[PDB]
Amino acid sequence: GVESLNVLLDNRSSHYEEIIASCHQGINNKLTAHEVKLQIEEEYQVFRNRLRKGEITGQFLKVDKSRLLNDFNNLYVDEVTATKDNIEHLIYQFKRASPILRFLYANIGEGNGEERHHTIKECQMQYWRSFLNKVKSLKLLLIFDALILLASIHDQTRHKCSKGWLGSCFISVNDRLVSLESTKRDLEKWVGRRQQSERSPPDKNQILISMFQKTILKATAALKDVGISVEHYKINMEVICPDSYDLILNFDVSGVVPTISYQEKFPFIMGGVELLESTDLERLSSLSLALVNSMKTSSTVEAYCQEFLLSGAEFQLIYQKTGECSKCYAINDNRVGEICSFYADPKRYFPAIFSAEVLQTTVSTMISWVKDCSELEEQLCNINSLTKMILVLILAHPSKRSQKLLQNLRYFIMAYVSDYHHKDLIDKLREELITDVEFLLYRLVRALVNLILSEDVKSMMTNRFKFILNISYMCHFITKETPDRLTDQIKCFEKFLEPKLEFGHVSINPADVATEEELDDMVYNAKKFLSKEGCTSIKGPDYKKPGVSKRFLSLLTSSFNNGSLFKESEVKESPQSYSSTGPDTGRLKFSLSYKEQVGGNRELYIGDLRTKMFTRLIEDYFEALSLQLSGSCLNNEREFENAILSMKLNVSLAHVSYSMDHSKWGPMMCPFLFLATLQNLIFLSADIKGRDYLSTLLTWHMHKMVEIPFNVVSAMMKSFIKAQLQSITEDFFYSNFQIGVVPSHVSSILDMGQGILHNTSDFYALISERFINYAISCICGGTIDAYTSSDDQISLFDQVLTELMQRDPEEFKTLIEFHYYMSDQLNKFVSPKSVIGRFVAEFKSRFYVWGDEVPLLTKFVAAALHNIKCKEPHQLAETIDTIIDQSVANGVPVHLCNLIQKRTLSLLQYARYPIDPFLLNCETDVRDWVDGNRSYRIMRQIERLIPDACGRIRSMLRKLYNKLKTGQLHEEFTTNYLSSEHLSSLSNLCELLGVEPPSESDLEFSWLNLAAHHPLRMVLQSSIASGFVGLCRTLGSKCVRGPNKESLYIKSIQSLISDIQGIEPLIDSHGVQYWRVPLNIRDGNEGVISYFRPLLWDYMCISLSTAIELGAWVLGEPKKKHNPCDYFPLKPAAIKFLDLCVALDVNCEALSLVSHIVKWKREEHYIVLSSELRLSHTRTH
Ligand SMILES: [Mg+2]
Ligand SMILES: [Zn+2]
């Protein structure tokens, strides 16, 4: 489609020629392989001589550990008036630093007696509440309030229980907090007025009962329509008394009133609970569940309350506003009100709801790493306290500044174990802290760092490196959503506009028909961009300024044309006219947005369909050109494996390594650079017409327009109209408003699309790094390798430079300086987070050392925790299965993954959904992830459920597999078995061979399968909490499609099942349900036995499909100080059968064995702990 341009006209004026002239002005791309070394050596001599004097700065320092520690200590020394805290003071003032932290450690409910045993029995008030809440969801509210009050009175006058009141108020129906006396007066007035109306014989003590009977009759009539009975609710009709009006009109309750404080009052002790136990994570889970449930309340078109029980006592959480936004919460108790009041956010509190044994196991497995040390065995009780405190603090107060504070520790711990580092590093690990909890977090982190990385500890460096590198990945535990949306759109525009005001080129309104001023400005700025000088001048190099010099561009193009950079094997509606500024129907337009990240943020450009069509041509061209060469890893797949092998070898040999990053990659490149580079290359010497079309496309990209967001302009206009009757981004809008017209679009020469022109940037990086390495090898006597991903890079040195680093340090530092300068001379800026060393190597967030391996445990656990959505409950299981399968292959133990699976099953059980044996298997081991797949795990679960019935089936399957692998019967089977009855076929199938048929007592095992006629309805999120709320709301409305055409409930089906005294349920330990259904009642009732499916049929089918996919070992019979750092690499077990596979697929609506090969990808190689490969099962042939 690239050549399609030839169908258009050609209206190119004398503007398209000046750009080519400027890009061809003073560049010499015909030099020879002998005249470049002289220039390189002259530059090196001048630079070295000028640097030895003192007229150029060094930008690099040698690593000294004492200076690094003493600079990390007093990093915030203006507010923290201390130098060395004691751990006892920290543990003391940790449990008293907030209301939420005071509540998690107080001595609440000091006496738990029979009033704590009564909280398991269900009174009548809650039954009536549930019934009326159900009825309401299909004058009025007064009757419901009166019924609730009557139920409460009848519950109190029997066994003296008071659970549903708060002083004088009482939660009645919609979490409301209606008063008491007001209802009495309302009922009095209502009954009086009704009697005065009906008068012109009865009493006020019978009209109420009449209305009660009418209302309950209408309700029970409307509720029996859908199919739900009344026995499910277990309500007692005796709550209504013949004397009910004068029973209500005399009640008397007294207590303590609640309140909310919108601005030493704590009524409990402060430091009861310890830290070694697990008493606070459960309280946190309960409080978080209440805070998330507080988003269900309806708009009502006041006071709302939620309830939770910790240790048999009952607490209430009250609020005064509905919706999903920040509000003020208060915690109350029926003994004394107003325990505390805070200002939390309803979201951001998901990751700790049912996960209290996973976090304890995470801490316990992280601490066992540094346990063999001898310099740490005395103070091994403080590390536990500090780790647990950091975790709990991160979970209780989710902030955006703590995330960056914890993320910045990775670069410190990386620079601590290196040889050289950038001098401007400490100024980067400094973020603005505001509140009083972030300073406490910093002090805890500092105490732990100074405790672990001491000076008299020199035993095991790799374990401590792993430990410290794992405390910095605890920021993934918070969130990646945004606190406020109107501020990030301001920060994004600030980032967009800041670097374009220093260069001095900004166009306000292009008008889509450019004037002469814009063309002259473009020409002038294109000439200014190519006028950078350095190292042969008066001043010298001006670091961190956009531009390229003609000398190095000439050298690069000449060296590419010679053939010095190649390897050994590398040398073998439709518009009609177009100008140099765009098509006839307008220039290219883009819009701005941002993207969510852990840490900062990242811009995003969005275009319409025509520009998306036009950009793909350049993208494909440059991707093909980059594939022709070798060295890039952005889209290739063998290059990444080669890079990993080279990194492993380099680290094993103890050579030098250089891990780099480049800053401001996006907003510093430009399409003019790519144009000027492309115009000076000779490829093979029709194609020149392709080069012309490419130049035209890049010229179109050079004149694009970006649209300013609307909220920012509105905010600026309001701020101006307010302050009139302050930054560089403010004076722009101010001086534009002061003279009328307002800004809407922006155009300039100094920005490429972030995430748009990736592949051309990768190509440019490839060739530039090749040239730089060539020059460096030319000067000295050593060589270098390189691998790029368009903003990341690793460099592996050789033996010569490794020895030169220790024999002549000054020449090594001078070579590093020359590399930095020569790289800056080509529009590439090395970041202050790059390192040179011999202990570790890093590339694409992958770390490699010698003697151990570095798994990122906390990252995977955090990624697995909050990963749920509002989908069908049979697709979330596959997502969790895939995540856990990917995480086991890196070094996470399986006993920590079984707990995550149990957590997911508990999340599903809370929403009142039945659990079938086709969801998860929380009893696996190593061999179920290395050798088998999902189908093998489900087979193992079914074999665990019902043994003594899977042996004969396995023998029949073995004989059938032996008979089918030769071709004796391939059609006698797949035509009158897979399309017949399920139960009356297996008998004759096993009779056909010489095996005992399955017994009549094994064919009753069945399982319940909703969506047996049509898939259940889900659509009728912007956050995970809203996803969980919507999931809990959807399962419970209809979510069922009946046989002909209708909608049902999940409770009606279970009621109908209970209406038959011939079926049995059976539940396992984890909570898996399977039924026993006989074969005589199976007939006669055809309306509700339409949902059950037999088990042995699905078992046979799935087992045969797995035996066809994997080997023939799955049909056999099953049979059944170690330090935490001992790893071993493992590899998995690796037409005419595809028709049989597709046949066996559609006959079982349980799994999708063929989808796993189209959507998902396998794992290449595993690494596992050697202590878990001992305990395992083995299946032979
Ligand atoms: Mg890197
Ligand atoms: Zn009771």
Residue numbers in the entry: 199 to 336, 344 to 405, 410 to 472, 477 to 514, 533 to 803, 1102 to 1214, 1219 to 1258, 1266 to 1560, ...
Q: Which lines from the publication concern this structure?
A:
The large (L) protein of LASV is a multi-domain molecular machine that binds the conserved 3′ and 5′ ends (the ‘promoter’) of each of the two viral RNA (vRNA) genome segments (denoted L and S) and plays a central role in the viral life cycle, which is entirely cytoplasmic. Transcription is initiated using a capped primer derived from host mRNA by a yet to be elucidated ‘cap-snatching’ mechanism involving the intrinsic endonuclease (EN) of the L protein and possibly its cap-binding domain (CBD).
From grids of the apo-state, two different 3D classes were separated. Masked refinement of the common regions of the two apo-structures yielded a map of the APO-CORE with an improved resolution of 3.14 Å that allowed a more accurate model to be built.
